[PDB]
């Protein structure tokens, strides 16, 4: 089991203050990189790769 938000498409929200963030890609089964515009979007949105890996891979 992993949190439900791991299965969401990565969402840059509606702002343009783009910063790198990490999300889980279920199609490829790994954590990957996107640009987040800084406001809104969803919880498939991590500051580090390591964090994405520990939350959206496997059942903790």
């Amino acid at each position: 089991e992993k949190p439900d938000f791991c299965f969401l498409e990565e969402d840059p929200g509606i702002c343009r203050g783009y910063i790198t963030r990490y999300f889980y890609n279920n199609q490829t089964k790994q954590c990957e990189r996107f640009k987040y515009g800084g406001c809104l979007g969803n919880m498939n949105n991590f500051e580090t790769l390591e964090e994405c890996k520990n939350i959206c891979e496997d059942g903790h």
Epitope: E9, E10, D11, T20, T28, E32, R33, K35, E47, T48
Partner: antibody
Framework: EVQLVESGGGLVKPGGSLRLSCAAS????????MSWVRQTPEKRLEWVAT????????YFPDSVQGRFTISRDNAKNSLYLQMNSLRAEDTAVYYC??????????????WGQGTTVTVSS | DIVMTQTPLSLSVTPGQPASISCKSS???????????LNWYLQKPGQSPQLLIY???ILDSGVPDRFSGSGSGTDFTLKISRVEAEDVGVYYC?????????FGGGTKVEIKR
């Protein structure tokens, strides 16, 4: 054996509009974000739009942002770049590319041969 | 935006001799996952740019092993160990660590005959 085939370029008057199409073949289209890059006559290259896999989210740089919009159709393997408010400086060849994924360092690849947009009176 | 400065503008190389092309970024390209998003393209005569190298040093499928990439932070280097006829064209760099992703101005390569 990926192929991307842009069409839709022509002359457009300044402040006018034009839609460009990209027809994709040879891979599972909805698995990839997709991009447009342009090349000016001075042969400068400039990334100008990205659409997310589902087609729900898009990115654009400040130079085109609020003038251009993008959409895709995953049942048809196509995407469309709607350009509005065209200015002299949007004259370029526009190329479609595939955003190759995290394992490919987010590089764009498989650029089409491109369609040429000319903004003139 | 990040400015990518490529030198030389052009180069002319004896066949079988090496060639080198520099790309310098105005800020470090080191990303928060520890990788570096610096890529090399080739535009061959009559063709659109094609990916040669991504993540600084990784060859794309089908790129000859004559080509290699190195560097880090702000300073990058494309090398052709022994130049051949097929390598002629304009080479560009691209960085994608920072938004918006931005190209180098290109470097034309001519081969001697």
């Amino acid at each position: 054996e990926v192929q991307l085939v842009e069409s839709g370029g022509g002359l457009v008057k300044p402040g006018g509009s034009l839609r460009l199409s990209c027809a994709a073949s040879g891979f599972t289209f909805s698995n990839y974000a997709m991009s447009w890059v342009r090349q000016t006559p001075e042969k400068r290259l400039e990334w100008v739009a990205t659409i997310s896999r589902s087609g729900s989210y898009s990115y654009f740089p400040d130079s085109v942002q609020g003038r251009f919009t993008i959409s895709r159709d995953n049942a048809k393997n196509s995407l469309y770049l709607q350009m509005n408010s065209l200015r002299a400086e949007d004259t370029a060849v526009y190329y479609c590319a595939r955003l190759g994924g995290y394992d490919e360092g987010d590089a764009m690849d498989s650029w089409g041969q491109g369609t040429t947009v000319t903004v003139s009176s | 935006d990040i400015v990518m400065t490529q030198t030389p503008l052009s180069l002319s190389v004896t066949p079988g001799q090496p060639a080198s092309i520099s790309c310098k970024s105005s800020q470090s390209l080191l990303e928060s996952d520890g990788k570096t998003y610096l890529n090399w393209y080739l535009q061959k005569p009559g063709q659109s740019p094609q990916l040669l190298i991504y993540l600084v040093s990784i060859l794309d499928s089908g790129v000859p092993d004559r080509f290699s990439g190195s560097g880090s932070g702000t300073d990058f280097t494309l090398k052709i160990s022994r130049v051949e006829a097929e390598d002629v064209g304009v080479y560009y760099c691209l960085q994608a660590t920072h938004f918006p992703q931005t190209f180098g101005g290109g470097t034309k390569v001519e081969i001697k005959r």
